[PDB]
C-alpha cells in the first residue's frame, strides 16, 4: 500500500498546497512574519511533493529505479531537505509567536527564510553527493543506493545522528521552550483577567444590593480577588512601583468600603465601591487591556494553525526519528527485524504530513 499511499499524498498535497500558497500570497498577502514562514513551509512541502511520485513509482515496481542517477540524487536530497527546512521553519514560527505574544520585521524574515533554505540545502549535500544508481547483482534491479567509501566511513551514523539531533532534538527543545513561555504568559494574563472579572461581578452585585450582609460578602470576595490579582504581575522598577501601587490603592478602597459596610451604612459602601470603579481606570486599566490583548491571540486562527502544524509534524516524525536512532544503534554495534520491517512505514507516515498540512488551514481558518 506504500506505493499507492504515496499516490494519495501527491493528489491531495499538490492540490492542497497550491491553494495554500495562493491564499497566503493573494487573499491574505504577506502582511505578517508568520505568513512569510507559512508560505515558505508550503513551498518546501511542494518541493518535496514534486519528487514524491518518483518514490511512489520506485516502490510500485518492488524497489527498482527506472530513472537515471540524477533523479535518485534529487529525490534523496529532497527528502533530507524537506525534513530540515520544515523543522527550521517551524522553530522560526514558534519563536515568532513567542515574540508576538510575550514581547509585542519583514526583511529579516526574508533573510531568515533564505538562510533556512541555504542551510537545508547544505544539510542535504551528502545525499546529493553520494547517492547513485546501483545495479543489484547479475539481475537488472537498479536502486537509489548510498555509496560511502572507506575515507567517509561511519557517514550514515553521522547523518542519522544529525537527523535525530539537529532535526529533531534542538527543534523540539526550542519549540517546547517557546510554547511553555507562551503558556506562562497566558497563565499570568488569565489570572489577572479572571480576578478582575470576579471583582467586577462582585462590584455589580454590590450596586444592586439591599442589606449590608450582601455588601459585606461581595466586598470580601472583591478583596480576595484584588489580592490575587496583585500577585499576577504581568510577564516583563517602573512597573512594580505602579502595578503594585495601583492594587494597593484598590485594596485600600475595598477596606474603606468594608469599614463603612460593617457599621451598617450601605450607601457609603456603594459610594466607596464606585470610587473603586473610578480607580480602576487610573492604574489597572492599561494592564487589564494588555492582558486582554494577550489572551486575544489565542482565538487568532494563525496561532491555532501553527500549533496544530507543529504538534502534528512532531507526532508524524517521532516514529521515523526513533527508528533512525534504533538503526544507528544497530549499525554502531550497541544492539532488529522490526526496525527494518517498519522503516518504509515510518518514512511514509513521516512525510504524510505534507498531505494534510493544507487541511489545517481548511479547518482552523
Amino acid at each position, epitope marked *: 500500500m506504500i506505493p499507492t499511499l504515496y499516490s494519495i499524498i501527491f493528489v491531495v498535497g499538490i492540490f492542497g498546497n497550491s491553494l495554500v500558497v495562493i491564499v497566503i500570497y493573494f487573499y491574505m498577502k504577506l502582511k505578517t512574519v508568520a505568513s512569510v514562514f507559512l508560505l515558505n513551509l508550503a513551498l518546501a512541502d511542494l518541493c518535496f511533493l514534486l519528487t514524491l511520485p518518483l518514490w511512489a513509482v520506485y516502490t510500485a515496481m518492488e524497489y527498482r529505479w527506472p530513472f537515471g542517477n540524477y533523479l535518485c540524487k534529487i529525490a534523496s536530497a529532497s527528502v533530507s531537505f524537506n525534513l530540515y527546512a520544515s523543522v527550521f521553519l517551524l522553530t522560526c514560527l514558534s519563536i515568532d509567536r513567542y515574540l508576538a505574544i510575550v514581547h509585542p520585521t519583514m526583511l529579516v524574515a526574508k533573510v531568515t527564510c533564505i538562510i533556512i533554505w541555504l542551510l537545508a540545502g547544505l544539510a542535504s549535500l551528502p545525499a546529493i553527493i553520494h547517492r547513485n544508481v546501483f545495479f543489484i547483482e547479475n539481475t537488472n534491479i537498479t536502486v537509489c543506493a548510498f555509496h560511502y567509501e572507506s575515507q567517509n566511513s561511519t557517514l550514515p551514523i553521522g547523518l542519522g545522528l544529525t537527523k535525530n539531533i539537529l532535526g529533531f532534538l534542538f527543534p523540539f527543545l526550542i519549540i517546547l521552550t517557546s510554547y511553555t513561555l507562551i503558556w506562562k504568559a497566558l497563565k499570568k494574563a488569565y489570572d489577572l483577567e479572571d480576578n478582575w472579572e470576579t471583582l467586577n461581578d462582585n462590584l455589580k452585585v454590590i450596586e444592586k444590593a439591599d442589606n449590608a450582609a450582601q455588601v459585606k460578602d461581595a466586598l*470580601t470576595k472583591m478583596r480576595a480577588a484584588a489580592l490575587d490579582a496583585q500577585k499576577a504581575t504581568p510577564p516583563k522598577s517602573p512597573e512594580m512601583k505602579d502595578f503594585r501601587h495601583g492594587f494597593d490603592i484598590l485594596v485600600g478602597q475595598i477596606d474603606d468600603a468594608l*469599614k463603612l459596610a460593617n457599621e451598617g451604612k450601605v450607601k457609603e459602601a456603594q459610594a466607596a465601591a464606585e470610587q473603586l470603579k473610578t480607580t480602576r481606570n487610573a492604574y489597572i486599566q492599561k494592564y487589564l487591556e494588555r492582558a486582554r490583548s494577550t489572551l486575544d491571540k489565542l482565538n487568532d486562527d494563525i496561532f491555532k494553525i501553527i500549533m496544530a502544524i507543529v504538534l502534528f509534524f512532531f507526532f508524524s516524525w517521532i516514529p521515523h526519528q526513533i527508528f533512525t536512532f534504533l538503526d544507528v544503534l544497530i549499525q554502531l554495534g550497541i544492539i532488529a527485524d522490526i526496525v527494518d520491517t517498519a522503516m518504509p512505514i515510518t518514512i511514509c507516515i513521516a512525510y504524510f504530513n505534507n498531505c494534510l498540512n493544507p487541511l489545517f488551514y481548511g479547518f482552523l481558518g
Partner: antibody
Framework: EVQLVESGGGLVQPGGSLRLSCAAS????????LHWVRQAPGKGLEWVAY????????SYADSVKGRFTISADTSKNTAYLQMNSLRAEDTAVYYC?????????????????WGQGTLVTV | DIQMTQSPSSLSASVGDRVTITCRAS??????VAWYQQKPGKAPKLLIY???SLYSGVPSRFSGSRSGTDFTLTISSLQPEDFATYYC??????????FGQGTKVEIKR
C-alpha cells in the same frame, strides 16, 4: 523589646463586668491594630474583637457582638476591652495580638507579636 | 464568614521525620493564611506570615505552600522542639479573622 502585656484578668462572678487592659511596649499603637483573641481551655483560638486606633473603627465577633466594648488610649499605647453580662463561654484566656496596616509587609505579618494572655473565669 | 478546616486533627511523629498539615478555606482568601505555633501554656508564635513566606527568626525547616484553597505547612527536620499545636489563620480582613481547629504534634511510639 517590642511586646504586649495583659492585665485585669481574674476570677469574677458571672453576669458582671471586666476590664482587660493591653499595654504595648516598643511600638506605637497608632501604627497598628490591636485585636483580642480568646482561647477556651482545651480548645482552639477564637477571634473576639479588634480596634484600629488611628481610624477609630472597631469590630466584634458575632458571638460577642453587642456585649463588649473595645477602646484604646494612644497616650500610653494601651487597649481596653470592657465585658458586660459575662457568660459561661467567656471563661477563656484572652490574648492581645498586634496586626499591621495596609499596604505593605506589616499587613501580611498577621499577629506577629501576641500578648501573654490573661485567664478569665466565671 | 470564611471557615478554615484542618484535616490532621492529631499528628504523631518521631524526631527527624517530615510532617504536613493541610488547611482548607471555605472560599478564596488569596495568600492571606498565616501559620502559628502554640506551645501548651504559652502564647502562639507566628511561623508563616503569607501563605508560603517564612517569618523572621523561626527555624528554616518550616515551609508553606498554597494551591488554590489548600494551604500546607511542612516540617522536614522535626526536632524535639516541634511538639506543640499548629493553627492556620485566614486573615483576609481585620474583622474576618478565622483560626483553624488545630493540630498538635505528638511523639510517635
Amino acid at each position: 523589646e517590642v511586646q504586649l502585656v495583659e492585665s485585669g484578668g481574674g476570677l469574677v462572678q458571672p453576669g458582671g463586668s471586666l476590664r482587660l487592659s493591653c499595654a504595648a511596649s516598643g511600638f506605637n499603637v497608632v501604627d497598628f491594630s490591636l485585636h483580642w483573641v480568646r482561647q477556651a481551655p482545651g480548645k482552639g483560638l477564637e477571634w473576639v474583637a479588634y480596634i484600629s486606633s488611628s481610624s477609630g473603627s472597631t469590630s466584634y465577633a458575632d458571638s460577642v457582638k453587642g456585649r463588649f466594648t473595645i477602646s484604646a488610649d494612644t497616650s500610653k499605647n494601651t487597649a481596653y476591652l470592657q465585658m458586660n453580662s459575662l457568660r459561661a463561654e467567656d471563661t477563656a484566656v484572652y490574648y492581645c495580638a498586634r496586626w499591621g496596616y495596609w499596604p505593605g509587609e506589616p499587613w501580611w505579618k498577621a499577629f506577629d507579636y501576641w500578648g501573654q494572655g490573661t485567664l478569665v473565669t466565671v | 464568614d470564611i471557615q478554615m478546616t484542618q484535616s490532621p486533627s492529631s499528628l504523631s511523629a518521631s524526631v527527624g521525620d517530615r510532617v504536613t498539615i493541610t488547611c482548607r478555606a471555605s472560599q478564596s482568601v488569596s495568600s492571606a493564611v498565616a501559620w502559628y505555633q502554640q506551645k501548651p501554656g504559652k502564647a502562639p508564635k507566628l511561623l508563616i506570615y503569607s501563605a508560603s513566606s517564612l517569618y523572621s527568626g523561626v527555624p528554616s525547616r518550616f515551609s508553606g505552600s498554597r494551591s488554590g484553597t489548600d494551604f500546607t505547612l511542612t516540617i522536614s527536620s522535626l526536632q524535639p522542639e516541634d511538639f506543640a499545636t499548629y493553627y492556620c489563620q485566614q486573615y483576609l480582613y481585620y474583622s474576618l479573622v478565622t483560626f483553624g481547629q488545630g493540630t498538635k504534634v505528638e511523639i510517635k511510639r
